[PDB]
Amino acid sequence: ITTEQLTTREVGGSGVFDALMQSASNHLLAEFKNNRITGGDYVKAYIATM
């Protein structure tokens, strides 16, 4: 087990932390594409879960 298996320092993926962030971002964007929230709410929730 190495550090690169935890996070690869990229937004893309191939890490546990990166995948955990991307899934939450995908769910928030899914709610965002429906006219239910704006950009600010999505950004704040993302930063909160970070």
Added chain:
Amino acid sequence: MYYIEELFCRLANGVLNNTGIVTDDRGDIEDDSKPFIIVAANEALTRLHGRFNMRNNNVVVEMQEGRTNYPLLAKYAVQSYDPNEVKCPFIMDLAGEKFAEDVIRILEVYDDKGRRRPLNDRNNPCSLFTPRPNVLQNNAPKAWEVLNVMYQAKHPKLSTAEDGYNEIDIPDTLDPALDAYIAYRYYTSLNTPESSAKAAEYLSFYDSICREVVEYDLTSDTEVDTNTLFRKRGWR
């Protein structure tokens, strides 16, 4: 009088330093966010030119036999008309000055013989009416009759498309007002609690600068003339 690129580099090196629009060298705005800045700049210029009465311009309109309504649009300008749609234009232009629609308010209208024509006077048969702010009416057109329209004008449209106007004509005391208005628009558009608090500050700064410029009368807006009613009324 300076290019549009000077405006982009002033917004890149003034306000909006800390934002993500600017490029890495912080010398210019990215290609993605230029339409937003252009829209904001046009809105700000319209606001200022409506408030302050800076530019005064002129149009020459000649009268046809069967027309009473003369809309002031580029479709009827000589340099911009479509020959199949419009048989004969009535607004005269020049190859360098192509008469972009910049009419806010009509002040004076003068005949080709040097006599003034009353405007929007209901009880005067020989007067001109404006059904719409950019349309004229003359109920009795005549042969060899031409009219001159003296109107307050707004700034030409900035387009940055190799045919639009790159330059900006504005007094140097009102650059911060334009910058503050652009920053206000950009910071409101973010939709966060802190950005709105910053945008309120920028809008208040714009208002205070405009009020100061009015206070010191830097644009010479106030106008006074000699008294001629003394002789007309019969005084001695």
Added chain:
Amino acid sequence: MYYIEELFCRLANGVLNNTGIVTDDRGDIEDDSKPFIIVAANEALTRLHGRFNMRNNNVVVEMQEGRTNYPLLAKYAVQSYDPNEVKCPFIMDLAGEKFAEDVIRILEVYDDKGRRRPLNDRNNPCSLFTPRPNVLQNNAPKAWEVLNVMYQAKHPKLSTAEDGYNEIDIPDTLDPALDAYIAYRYYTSLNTPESSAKAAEYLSFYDSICREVVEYDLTSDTEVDTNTLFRKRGWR
């Protein structure tokens, strides 16, 4: 009358001492952050010169046969015109200086024969008009006619580009106002609440200093002249 380097050093020592712009030895502003300071300084100088009426300058305009609008720009100056584009310039800079474009407001216009010419007077046929704040009209140009324009001026642009104006000419009592305005601009651009509070403090300091200078009349702004209407009206 100090150069731009003295301004950079005084900022590096005074306000903005604690910030990350300043170099390690606290001697001078870093290279990449100089355009920001230049823009802020130009804005502050324009503000002060608009408020206080410190500078009074003059320009000489000669009248051509077919031209009615005489814009006051550096394009038509002798020391700055391009021979290819402009065939004949009408702004004379024979003796000294270069006539940087610094026209805020026009006060007096005198003929070459010593007679005054009214400005913006509708009811006087022999008057001069300004369709734009720096453009000047005469509707009857004549041969061998020259006009002298006395106007309020602003500080010439600072560029630090090996050809711009390095020097700053400002009354000694108004240095803290300029420094406070620059600090306000920077701390506002930081986009944090504490920096916003500091910016509010600096702007209030600027306003208070300007009001104090107005209170004590240190720039000799107030002007009073001998009465001349006592004799014109026929009193004895």
